[PDB]
């Protein structure tokens, strides 16, 4: 009956309500071509869009629409939501009703202008924006629980206790897999492997994806990738040449543990989780100590728990017992949180209407949100 | 061991040195190696068989030239040794490299491994006592005297934008990009197939950069200058043909602010100085627009900073006082600043000693250049 | 409805015919015949005065409408395969003798080398264009031509005849009408095409290899046969001289550059995901490529250079395929315009037309604004 659609700022997730796992899954690129005089040949799009964009990436300008889990680039988003329904899902949005998802602490404007593309463009007859750190936690299972959320757009934390948000105790934070990526691309220039434009930046995300992993002891790691040349794997590329790097793989995702490399100035995702548990109340520390849980595909580097739980036991008192929920389903988990509330009975009454929005307006939709 | 320390500016389109404590240098010439195309059957010819500077220059049509360094990265190890020993030669400089000290350059982010290797070339294969490498834009600010300020630069490799206030180089604040003087020569030679008058021999790719520097301009309104019709000027070559350039000549420089017309995405000397300004902190941006330097000869176009200043005033804020100051030696400002670097007793402290290298290697060349 | 005209315009020979036909009508060379006059001037020419190039169209294009198309092209459209960087002021002088003159209802100025992987239909492919001027190279990727990777070395049809007018006045065995050497000190061009095409035999990459360790500090000679000649003058033309003269397509020393070095550089600028369907793709057409036994001695000489130290770095392993056309070498960018015009009259719109020429200026070539 409903669709869930999960506008991440790198993999958009999209399907249907009460399954398993996405149906509709792609990179949100919409890369256009290289504008020259000269002509084509049989017909081309003007613009890609998703898969194909990332099929045929050696010429075109990918340019993501949303930087931040922020849409710059609206007409980008549209053609993206288009792309989405028509597609790949292969279902008007006319007839389903859409669930959303953006990021906590998000600027207000972009709901209005989220909804508004929704109703006035697409014509949906209801639709709602939940928070992802919420949907996280729904897909886990427990009421309880911190949702240490890390995309490739925004690192964020939500604190919530038996079926209560803390607002308050929410802390974004501008350090995510992008970031990341962006870092990994520099010190790989900085070993002679020069990738400036674009089409590399994806290859560049895919090495981050395979080789890379979070180091239990960073000093200890450096130590060892001086003296031994075992940990130095090699990668091959689509082209049929191949490079080997030794001491990028641990140092890439440092930079969340370590925000000083990138020059954010800003707290790590280790203490940030920590600050956001001491904003909460005194007497529901232990529990959201005891589900420290993880989501996004920022949290899917091997050993990222483990040195979470090195971290916050660092951090905390001694007499405290630390757990990550660390489950296999974490890359996928606000989206099949996102299908399980749509599953629900009770969120047949929580819908936005067409009605209510033509009494209402864009404003509405606060309400309903937190 | 404290003698006159030598001072060897660094380029992939040209090469410079001389002395410390001097106003200009006197030894000048471009950095490639000329090897002969045709066979030497008579004798009493030009022996050696490797040319390098003035002898090169003069010889154009028996030497098949090729430049050993490509975007600030030199390729072949083996013609910058040849060139870097005739410079410290009796043909040059008429002096020892055991004496010496040496003031090496570089573009920033450049790979650590040719580094290294430079730094290996100078201390075993010459015998130098003492080594220092240092960035382009630090010896600009030391040559014009200020502390503050932007240092846009154009040669014939790298464009890059380092914005440093009051001796404080902002790392993360770097932009880079792989287009420059050489590539600008690249597309007046694609220019001039479309004019008529084709050029192949690398020899005759020299007559293309004569060209360049000589008859080039950029306009305004590069619109406004395609809709009228151009007056098709001329210019005589070393042969004695003469050749009408047409729009090629006012097209070409349009690359460096438009690199659209390539077929490679680049940022553009325009936007590289607004995103090196925009990337730092918010307070030290109004003083970085107002101290803007430029450097290198890309940057000696006709209209050139006319147009540089229109570009910021599109993209800054408005109601801004921007201010791009140039020095009379654009080309020799690099230089000079490393001769006044030289020429200080702080000098003394910053360099990579012999001994030093033999005991640490390559970690203690990282640590002291930053 | 209406099929439309195709010319493929050159130097040397010029391709024309209707759209739609498997292959050209008919194929004059780029010459004309003028009464009083010693020698055919060549149509096609760069650099020189506009109101006499613009009277040899005419010319040219008055001679070839009647003989190979037998209509008026008034009342259908055109489709002028211009090689891509032939000269703004060629085009501009082209549109003006369509247009003013003649007045057609429509022209296109569309690529060579798009058009020749139209004719494979494949939509990504390197492509080769051996030429009588020059050698020309461009990758296509996804429709769009990759236009700053690209090469063309001065190395076609125009620099054989040159090496064989060479290499024949320097060792020369003319008979009585016996020996007297360089008695004649030129030679006509359309004789020169015909050795050419008939007695140059296309070595290996073995037998280019003893050759050139042979002119530097004499291996397979053989084999030789005379070349008749008119006015009872008879000339015994070697078989070391017509190899010898392949040679110099494929040398590599003191320049860095050949045929085959040309598409590794076009690949090295090239970039990282587009590089692999470019190496599959490898698509020879033009002039020169219809020698015999011509494709072997280019792949393996590509090969032979991939192996080197030099582009290991950057190319390594690839499978070099080269994917053949179905027309012949010459005929691939001919047969592509004429796939373009016939089928789409869609694509007849996006060309420029006679009402947008008079108000306007010029049609668009790839420049600014
Ligand atoms: N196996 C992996 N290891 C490390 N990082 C990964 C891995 N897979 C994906 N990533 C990173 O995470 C991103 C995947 O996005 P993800 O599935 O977290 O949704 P998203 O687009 O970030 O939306 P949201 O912000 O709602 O999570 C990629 O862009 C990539 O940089
Ligand atoms: N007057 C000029 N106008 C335009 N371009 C010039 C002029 N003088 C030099 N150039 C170009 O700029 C280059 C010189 O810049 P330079 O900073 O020395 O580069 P590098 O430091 O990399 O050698 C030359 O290679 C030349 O192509
Ligand atoms: N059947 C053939 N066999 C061998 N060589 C040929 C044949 N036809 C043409 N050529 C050669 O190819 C050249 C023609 O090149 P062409 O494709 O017309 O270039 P362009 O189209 O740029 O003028 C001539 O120099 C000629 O010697």
């Known amino acids: ?370 | ?370 | 409805e209406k099929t439309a005209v195709v010319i493929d315009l050159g130097e040397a020979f010029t391709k024309c015919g209707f759209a739609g036909e498997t292959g050209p009508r008919c194929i004059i060379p780029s010459v004309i015949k003028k009464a009083g006059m010693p020698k055919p001037i060549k149509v096609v020419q760069y650099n020189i005065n506009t109101e006499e190039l613009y009277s040899y169209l005419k010319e040219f294009i008055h001679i070839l409408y009647f003989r190979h198309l037998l209509v008026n092209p008034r009342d259908r459209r055109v489709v002028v395969i211009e090689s891509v960087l032939c000269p703004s002021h060629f085009r501009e002088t082209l549109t003006r003798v369509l247009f003013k003159y003649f007045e057609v209802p429509s022209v296109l100025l569309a690529p060579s080398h798009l058009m020749a992987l139209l004719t494979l239909g494949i939509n990504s492919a390197m492509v080769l264009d051996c030429g009588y001027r020059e050698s020309l190279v461009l990758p296509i990727y996804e429709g769009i031509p990759v236009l700053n990777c690209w090469g063309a070395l001065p190395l076609g049809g125009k620099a054989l005849h040159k090496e064989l007018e060479t290499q024949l006045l320097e060792q020369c065995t003319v008979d009585t009408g016996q020996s007297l050497p360089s008695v004649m000190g030129s030679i006509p061009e359309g004789v020169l095409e015909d050795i050419k095409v008939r007695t140059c035999f296309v070595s290996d990459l073995t037998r280019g290899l003893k050759i050139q360790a042979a002119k530097f500090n004499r291996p397979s000679p053989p084999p030789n046969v005379d070349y008749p000649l008119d006015g009872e003058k008879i000339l015994h033309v070697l078989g070391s001289i017509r190899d010898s003269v392949v040679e110099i397509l494929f040398e590599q020393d003191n320049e860095e550059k050949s045929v085959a070095t040309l598409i590794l550089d076009s690949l090295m600028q090239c970039p990282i995901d587009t590089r692999k369907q470019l190496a599959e793709n490898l698509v020879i057409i033009g002039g020169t490529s219809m020698l015999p036994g011509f494709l072997h001695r280019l792949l393996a000489e590509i090969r032979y250079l991939v192996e080197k130290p030099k582009y290991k770095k950057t190319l390594g392993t690839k499978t070099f395929r080269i994917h053949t056309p179905p027309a012949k070498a010459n005929c691939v960018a001919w047969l592509g315009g004429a796939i373009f015009g016939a089928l789409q009259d869609i694509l007849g719109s996006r060309s420029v037309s006679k009402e947008y020429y008079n108000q306007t200026g010029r049609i668009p070539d790839w420049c600014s604004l």
């Open chain 2, 1 to 370: 061991i404290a003698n006159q320390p030598v001072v060897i500016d660094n380029g992939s389109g040209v090469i410079k040195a001389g002395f410390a404590g001097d106003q200009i240098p006197k030894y000048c010439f471009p950095n490639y190696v000329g090897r002969p195309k045709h066979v030497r059957v008579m004798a009493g010819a030009l022996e050696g068989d490797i040319f390098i500077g003035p002898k090169a220059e003069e010889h154009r049509g028996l030497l098949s030239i090729r430049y050993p360094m490509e975007h600030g990265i030199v390729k072949d190890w083996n013609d910058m040794e040849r060139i870097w020993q005739y410079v410290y030669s009796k043909e040059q400089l008429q002096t020892f490299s055991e004496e010496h000290p040496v003031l090496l350059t570089e573009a920033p982010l450049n790979p650590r491994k040719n580094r290294e290797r430079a730094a290996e070339v100078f201390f075993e294969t010459f015998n130098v006592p003492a080594l220092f490498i240092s960035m382009q834009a630090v010896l600009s600010l030391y040559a014009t005297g200020r502390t503050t300020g932007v240092v846009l630069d154009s040669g014939d490799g790298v464009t890059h934008a380092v914005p440093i206030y009051e001796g404080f180089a902002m790392p993360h604040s770097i932009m880079r990009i792989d287009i420059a003087g050489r590539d600008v020569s690249r597309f007046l030679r694609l220019y001039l197939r479309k004019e008529g008058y084709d050029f192949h021999s690398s020899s005759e790719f020299e007559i293309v950069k004569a060209i360049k520097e000589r008859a080039c301009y950029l306009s305004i309104n590069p619109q406004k200058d395609e809709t009228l019709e151009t007056e098709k000027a001329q210019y005589y070559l070393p042969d004695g043909s003469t050749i009408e350039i047409g729009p090629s000549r006012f097209r070409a420089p349009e690359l460096l602010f438009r690199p659209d017309l390539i077929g490679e995405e680049s940022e553009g000397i325009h936007e590289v100085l607004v995103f090196a300004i925009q990337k730092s902190d918010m307070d030290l941006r109004r003083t970085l627009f107002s101290n803007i330097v430029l450097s290198g000869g890309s940057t000696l176009f006709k209209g050139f900073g006319d147009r540089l200043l229109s570009e910021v005033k599109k993209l800054a804020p408005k109601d801004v006082k921007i201010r791009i100051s140039a020095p009379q030696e654009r080309l020799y400002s690099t230089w000079i600043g490393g001769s006044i670097l030289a020429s200080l007793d702080t000098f003394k402290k910053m360099w990579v000693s012999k001994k030093e290298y033999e005991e640490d290697g390559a970690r203690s060349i990282h640590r002291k250049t930053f």
């Open chain 1, 1 to 370: 009956a409903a669709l869930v659609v999960d506008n991440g700022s790198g993999m958009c997730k999209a399907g249907f309500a009460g399954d398993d796992a996405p149906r509709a899954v792609f990179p949100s690129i919409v890369g256009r071509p290289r504008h020259q005089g000269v002509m084509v040949g049989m017909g081309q799009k003007d613009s890609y869009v998703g898969d194909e964009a990332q099929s045929k990436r050696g010429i075109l300008t990918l340019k993501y629409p949303i930087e931040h889990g922020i849409v710059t680039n609206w007409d980008d988003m549209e053609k993206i939501w288009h792309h989405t329904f028509y597609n790949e899902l292969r279902v008007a949005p006319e007839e389903h009703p859409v669930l959303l998802t953006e990021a906590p602490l998000n600027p207000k404007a972009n709901r209005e202008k989220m909804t508004q593309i929704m109703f006035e463009t697409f014509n949906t007859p209801a639709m709602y924006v939940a928070i992802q750190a919420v949907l996280s936690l729904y897909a886990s299972g427990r009421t309880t629980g911190i949702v240490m959320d890390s995309g490739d757009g925004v690192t964020h934390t939500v604190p919530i206790y038996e079926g209560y948000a803390l607002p308050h105790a929410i802390l974004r934070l501008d350090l995510a897999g992008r970031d990341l990526t962006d870092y990994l691309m520099k010190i790989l220039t900085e070993r002679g492997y020069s990738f400036t434009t674009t089409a590399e930046r994806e290859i560049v995300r895919d090495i981050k994806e395979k080789l890379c992993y979070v180091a239990l002891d960073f000093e200890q790691e450096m130590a060892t990738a001086a003296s031994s040349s075992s940990l130095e794997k090699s990668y091959e590329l689509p082209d049929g040449q191949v490079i080997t790097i030794g001491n990028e793989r641990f140092r890439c995702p440092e930079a969340l543990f370590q925000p000083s490399f990138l020059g954010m100035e800003s707290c790590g995702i280790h203490e940030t989780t920590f600050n956001s548990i001491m904003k909460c109340d005194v007497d529901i520390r232990k529990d959201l100590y005891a589900n420290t849980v993880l989501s996004g595909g920022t949290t899917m580097y091997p050993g990222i728990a483990d040195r979470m739980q090195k971290e916050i036991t660092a951090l905390a008192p001694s007499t405290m017992k630390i757990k990550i929920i660390a489950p296999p389903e974490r890359k996928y988990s606000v989206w099949i949180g996102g299908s399980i509330l749509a599953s629900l009975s009770t969120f047949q009454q929580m819908w936005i209407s067409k009605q209510e929005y033509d009494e209402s307006g864009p404003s509405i939709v606060h309400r309903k949100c937190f």
